[PDB]
Amino acid sequence: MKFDKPAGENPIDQLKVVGRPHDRIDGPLKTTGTARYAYEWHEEAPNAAYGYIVGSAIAKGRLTALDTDAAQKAPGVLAVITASNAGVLGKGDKNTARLLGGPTIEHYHQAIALVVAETFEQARAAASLVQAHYRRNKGAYSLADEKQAVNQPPEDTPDKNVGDFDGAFTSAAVKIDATYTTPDQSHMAMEPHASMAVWDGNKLTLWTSNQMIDWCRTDLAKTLKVPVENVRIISPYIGGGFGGKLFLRSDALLAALAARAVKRPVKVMLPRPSIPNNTTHRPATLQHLRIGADQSGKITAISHESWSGNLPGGTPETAVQQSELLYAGANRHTGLRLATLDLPEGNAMRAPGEAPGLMALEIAIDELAEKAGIDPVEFRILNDTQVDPAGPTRCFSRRQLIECLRTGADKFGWKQRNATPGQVRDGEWLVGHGVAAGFRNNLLEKSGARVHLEQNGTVTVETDMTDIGTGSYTILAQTAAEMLGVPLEQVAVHLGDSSFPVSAGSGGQWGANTSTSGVYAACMKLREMIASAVGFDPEQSQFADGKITNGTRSATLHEATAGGRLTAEESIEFGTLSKEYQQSTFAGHFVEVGVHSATGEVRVRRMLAVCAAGRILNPKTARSQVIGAMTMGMGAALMEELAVDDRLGYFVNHDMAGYEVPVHADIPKQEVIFLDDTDPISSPMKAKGVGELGLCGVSAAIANAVYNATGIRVRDYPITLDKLLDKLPDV
Amino acid sequence: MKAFTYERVNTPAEAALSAQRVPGAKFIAGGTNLLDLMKLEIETPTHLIDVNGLGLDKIEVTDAGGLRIGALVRNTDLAAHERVRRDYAVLSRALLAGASGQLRNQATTAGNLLQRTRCPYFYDTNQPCNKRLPGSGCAALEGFSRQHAVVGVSEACIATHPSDMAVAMRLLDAVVETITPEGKTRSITLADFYHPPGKTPHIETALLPGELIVAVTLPPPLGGKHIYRKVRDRASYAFALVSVAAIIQPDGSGRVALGGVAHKPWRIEAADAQLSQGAQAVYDTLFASAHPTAENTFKLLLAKRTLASVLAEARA
Amino acid sequence: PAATPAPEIMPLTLKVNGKTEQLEVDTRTTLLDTLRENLHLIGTKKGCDHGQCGACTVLVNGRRLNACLTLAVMHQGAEITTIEGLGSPDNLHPMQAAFIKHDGFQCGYCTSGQICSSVAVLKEIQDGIPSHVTVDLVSAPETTADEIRERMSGNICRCGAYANILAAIEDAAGE
Ligand SMILES: Cc1cc2nc3c(=O)[nH]c(=O)nc-3n(C[C@H](O)[C@H](O)[C@H](O)COP(=O)(O)OP(=O)(O)OC[C@H]3O[C@@H](n4cnc5c(N)ncnc54)[C@H](O)[C@@H]3O)c2cc1C
Ligand SMILES: Nc1ccn([C@@H]2O[C@H](COP(=O)(O)OP(=O)(O)OC[C@H]3Oc4nc5nc(N)nc(O)c5nc4C(S)=C3S)[C@@H](O)[C@H]2O)c(=O)n1
Ligand code: SF4
Ligand code: MOS
Ligand code: FES
Ligand code: FES
Ligand SMILES: [Cl-]
Ligand SMILES: [Cl-]
Ligand SMILES: [Cl-]
Ligand SMILES: [Cl-]
Ligand SMILES: [Cl-]
Ligand SMILES: [Cl-]
Ligand SMILES: [Cl-]
Ligand SMILES: [Cl-]
Ligand SMILES: [Cl-]
Ligand SMILES: [Cl-]
Ligand SMILES: [Cl-]
Ligand SMILES: [Cl-]
Secondary structure, three states: OEEOOOOOOOHHHHOOOOOOOOOOOOHHHHHOOOOOOHHHOHHHOOOOEEEEEEEOOOOOEEEEEEEOHHHHOOOOEEEEEEHHHHOOOOOOOOOOOOOOOOOEEOOOOOEEEEEEEOOHHHHHHHHOOOEEEEEEOOOOOOHHHHHOOOOOOOOOOOOEEEOOHHHHHHHOOEEEEEEEEEOOEOOOOOOOOEEEEEEEOOEEEEEEOOOOHHHHHHHHHHHHOOOHHHEEEEOOOOOOOOOOOOOOOHHHHHHHHHHHHHOOOEEEEOOHHHHHHHOOEEOOEEEEEEEEEOOOOOEEEEEEEEEEEEOOOOOOOOOOHHHHOOOOOOEEEEEEEEEEOOOOOEOOOOOOOHHHHHHHHHHHHHHHHHHHOOOHHHHHHHOOOOEEOOEEEEEEOOOOHHHHHHHHHHHHOHHHOOOOOOOOEEOOEEEEEEEEEEEEEOOOOOEEEEEEEOOOOOEEEEOOOOOOOOOHHHHHHHHHHHHHOOOHHHEEEEOOEOOOOOOOOOOOOOHHHHHHHHHHHHHHHHHHHHHHHHOOOHHHEEEEOOEEEEOOEEEEHHHHOOOOOEEEEEEEEEOOHHHHOEOEEEEEEEEEEEEEOOOOOEEEEEEEEEEEOEOOOOHHHHHHHHHHHHHHHHHHHHOOOOOEEOOOOEEOOOOOOOOOOOOHHHOOEEEEEEOOOOOOOOOOOOEOOOOOHHHOOHHHHHHHHHHHHHOOOOOEOOOOHHHOHHHOOOO | OOOOEEEOOOOHHHHHHHHHHOOOEEEEOOOOOHHHHHHOOOOOOOEEEEOOOOOOOOEEEOOOOOEEEEOOOEHHHHHHOHHHHHHOHHHHHHHHHOOOHHHHHHOEHHHHHOOOOOOHHHHOOOOOEOOOOOOOOEHHHHOOOOOOOOOOOEOOEOOOOOOOHHHHHHHOOOEEEEEOOOOOEEEEEHHHOEOOOOOOOOOOEOOOOOOEEEEEEEOOOOOOEEEEEEEOOOOOOOOOOEEEEEEEOOOOOEEEEEEOOOOOOEOOHHHHOOHHHOHHHHHHHHOOOOOOOOOOOHHHHHHHHHHHHHHHHHHO | OOOOOOOOEEEEEEEEOOEEEEEEEEOOOEHHHHHHHHOOOOOOOOOOOOOOOOOOEEEEOOEEEEHHHOEHHHHOOOEEEOHHHHOEOOEOOHHHHHHHHHOOOOOOOOHHHHHHHHHHHHHHHHOOOOOOOOOOOOOOOOOOHHHHHHHOOOOOOOOOOHHHHHHHHHHHHOO
16 A cells, blocks of 8 residues: 555544553553563573673773683583674674674673573673783763864764854844753663574574564674575564664674574573663763744744764764754754764664753753743744744644643643742742653654454454554554454454564654554455455445445355455555655643752652644553653653763663662652644554654753752753752752 | 572571681672672672571560660561661661662661672772772772762772661661671670771771671660651662761750761761751761762762751751 | 682472472572573563562562572572462453553563562551651551552663552552
8 A cells, every 4th residue: 555645534533443542452461471571482492591791891992812711611601602703794784883892892891702501690600701801992982072073064964054043143132042961871671682592404583672573684684694584583572672672782693693503592681780881872962052032032043053972883863853843933053963982882762862852952942931031831832833944835744732732731730830930839849840842753664464354253463563562562453453343352463573564663653653554554455355255345345343334235254254264465655745744743741840948859749741643543552651751751851861981981870770760759640631633644544653752852841840940950961959959948 | 690509507606607617608698789799790609608597587675675686687677666666766767768678678687787889880890999809999089979978988999888777777876796606796886897998998897707797786765856868869769869867856966877978877976966056067077077079079068958957857 | 710610509499379399409590580490480570680670579478579689599498479370361360450451561571570569568558567658657557659659669660651550559459
C-alpha cells in the first residue's frame, strides 16, 4: 500500500477497539514471571555455556598483549575469544566503536575478550585471569576544553540561516544571551544487554534484547561476514532500551563468535558495572542561545549553537533542530559543532537532540519572557508558528501547541502561580511552578505484517516489530481486531522475530504508527480475500461481530475459511507528505516543585503533561509512556549525570547506585491529558509518535519551577542542591 | 568471585576459633556488603564462616538499664523493636533512613558497622586506590570527589564511612563487644573503633585477625527529642551527602553526630557542649580541621544549614 | 594471580514455592542464580547483581530480600517464594491482577520484583514496622501513599511505571 494522499474515512475511524484503554495483552506473562527475556531461553539450549566479558582497563591506547593461558586453564573453561583468534570481522553501519577491540583501544570498557565456561561463576572467576597489558595514548575527554577549537560545523551538516540574525538581535528591544550544559546520560534499562547464540552448521539463531530486529540481523551478519539469510534474530520481550538497544552491542557479537568456536550454545550478559562505559550514552552538550524580541514580545531573532563530542565518525547530539521549528522569528541561525572525544560512543537516548535542546531552549524562553514582562505561557502562544519559519509556504500538518498550553494552564491552576520568585512556602519548603513546551517530529518508515484469519475465527498477526514496554503487542492486536470486526481477545500477535515481515522497529517514536499502519495494509488485503471467499464486493462490505455484510447479504468469518486459513502479507510505504507538510508532535509540561529552604533538596510535588500526538491508539499504554517519560525527565533535571574523570577518560559512577535514577519516593502525582489530534496527513491510522515527545520539555519545566521557587537560575544540569545552597534564605 | 569453602558451626566460639585456624577466612552475616565486594574480587576470602543462627540475634535489656543488641540482629528488627523506638529513637530513625527494605531485612548490626566505603574508585579495580592497593594513589583526591569526606582526611584517602546506623551508635556512646580466637572478650567504644586513614587507609578498624563481634551495648536512655536528618539528591535509597543525628533536651543542650563528612561518624564533645549557642558555634568547632576538595566544599555549608534546621525542628 | 580455585560443591535442600528441591551447588552461587540457572525459575530477574535495583526480590520465610546478595547455601531448608509461587496466568494473584488493571509495568523486567515487594510491604505495615516517613515512631503505621512509596523505593523501575504501581498497590490493599 502506498500512502501518498491524506487519509479519508476508513475502518479505524469506528474506534470500537482502537483508541480504547485496553489492558496489555502481554500482562499475564509479564506479571507472573513467564515472559522470557534473552538470558532465559533454557529449553532452546539446555546445556548452554556462559560467556563472561573482559573490558578494557584503559580509555585509550594499544593492547600490547592479551594473554589467555591462565584463563584457559581455569576450572570449567572451554575457550577464550579474542580479536586475535576471532578472525577478520566486518563492522556494522550503526557501530562507530568496534564491538571487539584489539589491538587498538577506543574507549574504557571496550570488550577485548570473552571467557566461555561451564557455569556462570567459573566464567566470571576465569575472566579475572585474562592478562591484558597496555600502552596508554593521549586522549581528549573534556567537551568544555575542546569547545574553543571547534568553530565550524560538520561538512555534511551546514549551519542554517534565515534572514539577518545579527542585525535583528542588535535591533531587538529585549534579548537574552545565555549558555547551558547537559551532561552525558545513560539508559540504565533494567534488563542488562544479553544474547544467546546457537549455530546449526552455518545457520545462526540469536536470542537477544534489541529494539530493531532487521538492523540487528543485517549488522550482525556484516560483522561476522556471513550471509544475512543464515541469521535469525529473536527478541519478543525486551526489558527496556530507551535508544540503548537500537544497535548491535558486544553481547550479541561475542555470543555468536563464542558459540561458533566451542560448537555449543553460549549466552552472554553485559554485567551492570560494564554497561555505562561499554555501551552508548547520550552526549553531553554545551549550548549557546541568543534570542531577541520586539517591544510587543514577538521574537525577531533566534540563534542556537550546540557543541557535543564523540569518537571519530560518530554522531552529534542534534540539539538545535527544534529551534528551527518551534517558535516564530524571521531571523534565525542554528548550528552544530562536533568535537572529537575519546570517551565511550555517544549515541541515541530517548528523544536524541530534542531532550537536551529543549533543556536549554525552554529555560532561555522562560528568561526572555521574564525580561519582557510577559507570562511564559502567553509568551509561547504569542510566538506560535503554524508554518516552517524557514519555508513559510510549508504548513505543519497540524499543530496544537497553543491548545496544549491553554488546556494545561487551566487544569494545573497556572494562574495561581506567584510570578515573583521565592515568595511561597509550605512549611520549610519553597514552592514553585514552572512550564515548558515539548516538541518532537513525526517520522515515517516502511513497515509490513502478515495477518491470518484462522479456521476457528481467530486472527494471527506476525511482524518483526518489537515491544520494549511500549505496548506494541496490544495496539497491533487492537488494529487487527478493529479491521476484521473480531473481539480483541481473539487476536494473537507474534513479534520480534526475523522470520516475520520487516517492520520499522522501535525507534524515532515511529513504531506505533508505522507498525499499526502495516497491519492496516495487511488487513485491507485480508478483507478483500474474505470478501472474495464469500462472493461479495469488498468496496461495499462491512466487518463487525464476526461477520461480513454487504447491503442486503451477510456471512460469517467461519464460512470464509471453511476452505482453509486466509493469509495476507503487505507493507505500507510513504510518499512525499512528510516533505509537503511538517509533521510534528507537541506538549505542554507544568510542574510544581518544593525546594528545601535549608538543605536545597529538590522534590517534585505535581506534574501535568498535555500532549498532541495524533490519534491515540491506547490511552492507558500511551499514558504510561508519558508518565514514564515524565519520570525520566525528572531524572535528567535533578539527579542524572555520568561523572567524567577527564584524566582517566571514563564515566566514574558506572553502576545502578552511582548513576542515580528516580525511585518510588521521588514520584509525585503525575497527570496526562491527550488532545484529540487526529492527523490524516500522517497515515491511515492518523496517529503520531508519543514515546519520545513525553520527555521533551520536562526537565526545563522542572528547572523553571526551581527558579520560580528560589529565584536561582541554574543552567548546568542536573540541578542539585549544591548549585542552590549559597543563594537560599537564612536559617 | 573466587571459590571458597563454606562452614556452619554450632557456637560463636567455634566461629572465632575457625577464623583463627583458617588463613583468609571471613565471617558472613547478611552478605549485603561482603558479597558485593566478593563479586568484584575486592574481598577474596578462601573460606566463609556463617555467623547467623548462633544465638547472636537478641535485643535485651542490660542489668545497668541499657540495651544489649546482638551482632546478628537484622537492621529491620532493630529499627522495629518497641524499646528502640521509644527509648533510642535516633537509632531507629538512622536505620530506616538507609538502604531499602530488602537490604535492611538482611543487614545486621555488626555487618553494618563493618560496611566499607562507597568510593567509586575503590569499587573499580582498574583505578588508583590506596585503600585497595597501598601506594597506588588516590584517584578521588583530584578526581570526582563530590561524595567524599571533608574532615578527618589524609593525603592518602578522602573516603567516607557510609553507615547511617553507625552515626546514631556514636551519638549513643555504643560499645562494641567481641570475642577473640584466644577466647577472651573485649569491649571497644565505637568512638575508638574506626582508624584514621593516615598513610594506611587499607587499615580501617580496631578488630584483630578473626575477632568476632557478638553485640553492641547501649547505655540507659537519654530522653529528649531524637532527630536523624539525612540529606540526599534523591528521596530514598541513597547514601547521605550529609546527615545529622541529634538528641536535644528541653533546655536546648544535647549532642550531635554527623555522617557523610568523614571516615567515621563525626562527633566532638566540645561541640555538643555549645548546642544552646546555635549552629554556627557548633559548626566552627566541628569543622575547625576541615580540608575539603573544591567538589565537596558545599558539604561544609550544608552541614551548618542542616544543623540549623535540626535545632529549629527541636525548638518548634 | 596465575590461578583461581575450583568450585567447592555442596548439597543443598531448598523449599521453593512449596516444592522440596535437592541440589548440588557451587558455594558462590547466589539464591538468584540458583533459582534462574539451576531451577529454571526465570521469573526472578537480574538487573544489577549488586543490591541496587530490587529486580531479584524474593521472599525467604516470608521476608523480602534481594536474592543477588545472599548465597544459596545460607538458606538450607528455608521456604522460598518467587513470583511464580504467587500466581500464574490461569490463576493470577490479586496483586498480579491489580498490576494488569492499573498498568503498573511497561517492559516487565522490574515487575516480578515490584510484585513480590508489594506483597511483603503490606505485611510489613500490618506487622507494625515503621519507615523513614513514619512521623510517630511509637505508634502503628497506616497504609498511606507516602508509606508505600518509601517502602517500595528499593525496587527501581526505569520505565517509570511508579504512579501506576502505587495505584495497583492501593487497589490491592483496599480489598
Ligand atoms: C545499593 C545499597 C544501598 C545502601 N544504602 C545504605 C544506606 O543508605 N545506608 C547505610 O547505612 N547502609 C546502606 N547500605 C549498606 C548496608 O546497610 C550494609 O551492606 C549492611 O549493613 C552490611 O551488613 P551485613 O550483615 O550484610 O554485612 P556482611 O556483608 O555480611 O559483612 C560485612 C563485613 O562485616 C564482617 N562481619 C560480619 N558480621 C561480623 C561479626 N559479627 N563480626 C566480625 N565481622 C563480621 C564481614 O566479614 C564483612 O567484612 C546499602 C547497601 C546497598 C547494596
Ligand atoms: N498515537 C499513539 C502513539 C503511541 N501510543 C502508545 O505509545 C507507545 C509508543 O509508541 P511510539 O511513540 O510510536 O514509540 P515506538 O513504538 O517507536 O517506541 C520507541 C520509543 O519508545 C520510547 N518509550 C519506551 N518505553 C518503554 N517502556 N521502554 C523503552 O525502551 C522505551 N524507549 C523510548 C524510545 S527511545 C523510543 S524511540 C505505543 O506502543 C502505544 O502504547 C498510542 O497508544 N498512540
Ligand atoms: S578515597 Fe580512599 S577509597 Fe576512594 S580512591 Fe582515594 S584511597 Fe581508594
Ligand atoms: O529513537 Mo529512541 O530508541 S533514542
Ligand atoms: S539484581 Fe539484585 S538488586 Fe539488582
Ligand atoms: S517495567 Fe520496565 S523497568 Fe519497571
Ligand atoms: Cl476498554
Ligand atoms: Cl467496515
Ligand atoms: Cl480513555
Ligand atoms: Cl487510562
Ligand atoms: Cl551495579
Ligand atoms: Cl559515586
Ligand atoms: Cl486524556
Ligand atoms: Cl598509602
Ligand atoms: Cl565525644
Ligand atoms: Cl545557618
Ligand atoms: Cl588456586
Ligand atoms: Cl510476606
